[PDB]
Design a protein around this ligand. Sequence first.
Ligand SMILES: Nc1ncnc2c1ncn2[C@@H]1O[C@H](COP(=O)(O)OP(=O)(O)OP(O)(O)=S)[C@@H](O)[C@H]1O
Lengths: 422, 95, 85, 326
Amino acid sequence: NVTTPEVAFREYQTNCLASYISADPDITPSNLILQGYSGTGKTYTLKKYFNANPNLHAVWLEPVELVSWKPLLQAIARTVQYKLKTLYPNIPTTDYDPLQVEEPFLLVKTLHNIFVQYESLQEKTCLFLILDGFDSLQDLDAALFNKYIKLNELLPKDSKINIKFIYTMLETSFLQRYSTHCIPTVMFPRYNVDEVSTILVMSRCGELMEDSCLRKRIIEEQITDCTDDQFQNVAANFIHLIVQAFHSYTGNDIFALNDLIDFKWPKYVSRITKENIFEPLALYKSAIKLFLSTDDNLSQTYDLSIISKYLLIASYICSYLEPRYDASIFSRKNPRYLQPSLFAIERLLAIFQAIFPSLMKANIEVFQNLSELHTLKLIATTMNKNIDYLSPKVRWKVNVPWEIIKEISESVHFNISDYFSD
Amino acid sequence: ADAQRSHYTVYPEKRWELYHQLHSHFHDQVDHIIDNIEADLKAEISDLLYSETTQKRRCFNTIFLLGSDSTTKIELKDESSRYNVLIELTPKESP
Amino acid sequence: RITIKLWLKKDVKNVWENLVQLDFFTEKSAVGLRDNATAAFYASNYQFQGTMIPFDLRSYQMQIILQELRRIIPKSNMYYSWTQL
Amino acid sequence: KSRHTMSMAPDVTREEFSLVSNFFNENFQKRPRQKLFEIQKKMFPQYWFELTQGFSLLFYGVGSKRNFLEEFAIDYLSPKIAYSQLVNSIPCLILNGYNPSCNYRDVFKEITDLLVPAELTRSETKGNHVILQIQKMIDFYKNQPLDIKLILVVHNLDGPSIRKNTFQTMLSFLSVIRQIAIVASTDHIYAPLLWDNMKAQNYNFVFHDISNFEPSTVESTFQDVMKMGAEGAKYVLQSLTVNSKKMYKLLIETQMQNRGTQRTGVELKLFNHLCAADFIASNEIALRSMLREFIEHKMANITKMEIIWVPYTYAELEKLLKTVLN
DNA sequence: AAGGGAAAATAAACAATACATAACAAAACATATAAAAACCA
Ligand SMILES: Nc1ncnc2c1ncn2[C@@H]1O[C@H](COP(=O)(O)OP(=O)(O)OP(O)(O)=S)[C@@H](O)[C@H]1O
């Protein structure tokens, strides 16, 4: 028995989370998997349960604001004695150091020290720990996730307070590594095109009718006393069209819709009239220009000098020109798609001396622009970035695509498409 | 004798004066121009770092300093009842 | 053979981002999860070469093969002629 | 592929090489060498004058410059500048770049102690604070009276440790300071690959040629070629038991009966019987145990008959015959 | 002007070498505490 909440599209999943969670510890299963990709509101639908259940007690941890397991143990032990202070303030406490723990023994060593002074409680109370984002921990491995499963059983089972877990993770290839533990899973499905728009309208009406960019445009135009419902319609006409002209570009996201709205909204506001408030279809026909462009990209003619420009134009030549062909076709007498090959030194100046307008011999400034180009990360080393100077075995390679080469060819009037021949 | 040990220290004009009155006088014009762009770069970051009150107020402000030489130093306002600190991250310190 | 918006280059990347983190593709030589801690810590210090080639040339391989797509994609969709070669 | 090889060369021992090498490098072109050294001596006042402008002076050229730098830095310049400012003369801190054991921490720990410890700079010593500690050194030095207090020398700037990139940028920030004069030399043909327009902005390098075609005595020591195994196991046989000489002599005969490759080798069974024939090998174990000593110092090989063969050349084994075995 | 014919190019099988990364070692960088050792007093 529990007081379930109600939400928009989790009607099955609210039932199971009301099923798999009770305030009684015996009915409560130990470990749990909430799985789904980002863009399902699992952090939404979990907390939305918890606000409707003030009877239980939740301790909220956040792995994504941590970096490793060694603070993650320090994250747990600092918080439970922080929470149990605010739940039973009459109970005296030998407060321990949460900085002291760094190893997975030390947690259950300290939880053996924490819970024993809390033994005098009246009934078996549970205590739900919540980890949010267990796959995106940036030092994860295989033998961390099971390491947190068996933590319950190393605890004494007869204590008045029982710690149980709920794990939030993503990337369901990861969950397939641990199906043999058979812990109860509640998968969260992705969304469909209507329920994306249905979620988005009931979540963004509260800001886009109350933004001052509307409220300025209210008093700036001749304001007819349009209702909030009249503000609701144009907001709804905005949302029901923006998901229609962009759904193929964004997929079934919610986060990627929550910001593209907040980029194209004031540019939509300026192109309204006093009269198009009653005229929605012609309003889209006047504000058309934003609905067919992305506007997420905030093609350079590159800063580098002339001899460095020809230094780049010789380096792109060994993306296709092998040593078997080059010395014949460049006498002094297609892999456009493919990944670039590997240079060595002085093959550059082999090609550089050929393609330059006897007119040049001094190569001090030519050697200057090489490590200038190395700091630009346009030509990088194959090996580590340390010993590449003294000629040991060091291979070089470009990192510029074909188009920026093509503009920079014509920027110095040099022709390159002749020498690329499939 | 000792050259295989590394880094051993040891403790062992009528015309030119007319250069000397010219050289430094020129160099006073140099470095005074150098602090001008130094005051220029320090100014245009400082006003633009502040006074930008966005409405969402859940976003960091980013600044792209295009064409910059990776050595551009910055000073900050005092702006009391709040500490304002500077952190620099080298790519050498980015493992 | 017939009105379909062909998209640009600068936008497919935003769709290409979700496809690799939907695990429909993999990187070519990427050991995914190390077994224990000190083998993973030995992979963290190692600076990589695949990031040093740009985004559009990381040699992505396949998770779901072409022939199996014909069995799941219904014939009502217009691209059903493209499942088979 | 009939190639003449360095193994097929009349080789030269240790004392024979270095002595006749010392004869050439001190008597080959002696008269024109100091004749060059007197010609370039008149450039020495020109270097003194430009170096007051804080110019990082860099010397390129063929041949070793190590002797020339130490004459120019120590004897000529360092007391000349102390006399021209008005007491111990200006401290010279050389950096042997050909010595690979140069680090960035140790030489800079010398530098801040060579430079003035006017403040508690150990407070800013904290975790890489080296660029941090030198930055606090720079801005203070912008508002000091302009005089050189230190001249540093960096021999062989393309050396095996100095050419590392985190060390190179460390020297770059030193050179912008007006109080120190930076007189260095390199030898590489790709030395201007080391610097971009960022570092040379901090450096303001100028260049001068010095080509005296010196032999690089000190700079040859750390370097090695196959002069510096056929020569390795040439010394172990000179200190062993007397029986190992005989069982290697019987080894080397039938292994040269047929370059010294695999095919001239011998089977283990008959070689046991052969070294049983001259009352030498008792059995397989007593043979193999004093054959593992030839194995442990990599003096013989085995591939598959059960062929043990010596990895030295045809010419080498008869040299091992007539000299050390006999 | 024709033409021979050797240089250059192509292809394919095979061998030899280089490369990216995994696994690890070791040195620099960092902290902690009981025992020695100065050291006032
Ligand atoms: N039924 C719903 N009713 C209202 N809003 C919803 C509903 N489902 C999802 N949302 C919204 O979807 C947003 C997505 O929140 P998140 O929980 O971060 O998404 P996510 O899939 O959990 O990605 P994360 O944070 O990486 S786990 C929430 O902030 C809600 O505003």
